[PDB]
Design an enzyme around this catalytic site. Sequence first.
Site, short mmCIF file in Angstrom:
data_model
loop_
_atom_site.label_atom_id
_atom_site.label_comp_id
_atom_site.label_asym_id
_atom_site.label_seq_id
_atom_site.Cartn_x
_atom_site.Cartn_y
_atom_site.Cartn_z
N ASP A 35 11.80 8.00 3.23
CA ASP A 35 10.67 7.41 3.93
C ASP A 35 9.78 8.52 4.50
O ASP A 35 10.08 9.07 5.57
CB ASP A 35 11.22 6.54 5.06
N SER A 197 -8.76 9.77 2.03
CA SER A 197 -9.24 9.49 0.69
C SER A 197 -10.77 9.47 0.69
O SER A 197 -11.40 9.09 1.68
CB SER A 197 -8.70 8.13 0.24
#
Length: 328
Positions: A35, A197
């Site tokens: 994770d 992004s």
Amino acid sequence: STGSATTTPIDSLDDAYITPVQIGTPAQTLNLDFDTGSSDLWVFSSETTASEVDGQTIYTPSKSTTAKLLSGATWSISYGSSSSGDVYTDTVSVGGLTVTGQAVESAKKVSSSFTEDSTIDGLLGLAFSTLNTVSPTQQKTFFDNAKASLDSPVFTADLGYHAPGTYNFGFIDTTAYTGSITYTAVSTKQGFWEWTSTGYAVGSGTFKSTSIDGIADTGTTLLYLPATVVSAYWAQVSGAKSSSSVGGYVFPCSATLPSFTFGVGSARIVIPGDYIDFGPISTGSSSCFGGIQSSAGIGINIFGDVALKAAFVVFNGATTPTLGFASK
Ligand SMILES: O[C@@H]1CNC[C@H]1N1CCc2ccccc2C1
């Protein structure tokens, strides 16, 4: 040193991925969910309340000759799921890479979602050690403990769509991707692999340049993005709707989903439409759950497995961390 381990989807929907991890002496092999959005290595154990164990493999520290109880240390984590317990140090190996003295957080309690998933024996956190929950002395992640010994201070995630994949530590397998790796800046201020992004496209549509701050999180299944972006995606799927009762966008199972592209600098990662299908909302239904959902209720955007499995992802833990993405 290096390590390399295969990671496998737990079910036919790629709901999560498990990777075998050796703990203790003799080894006890548990299948952990790696994770990159958390920082605790915790396991089902001989100490876990018996009614909360349902098929998981447990760690029994009394059977490990290298386990040592960490005096006074406890942990407690929430993800709506939760778990808590005490702490041992022990030897931990992944894919041939060994750390001695790793904090292994043994669960005394786990919530129902963990109990109900017999395939996941615990978590191995790969976010920054500032998020580790052990008290009163915070502990280091497996990657932090290994880093100085690694050939290069990196790990890579290569998650498969309906297929096995690989976590590598200490090296970049240049045969595992196409083209080049584009690297992008990381902020560690919230303890995550947080990056921005450069925008998105839906299907064959025009790319929209817009900054989307989010986290690279292998422990989240879906792609959680701003409401405006998610609305633009589902508008291209005839019959899709946001369902309040289901808790997100659903779509007719007969639909063909468009791809979704996200930007990494000037580079582009294309998520095929099929990666966005999470199947019937309940057994036998002809309504299907979408793999792109709004982050509005969360407070952060999350590039979970739906996005990451479309790429070869480098988690570069150099002095100034960065993230790399390549197509594959
Ligand atoms: O469940 C996830 C698995 N990887 C870590 C966990 N995180 C993700 C990020 C996040 C953001 C806001 C509130 C909660 C969470 C939980």
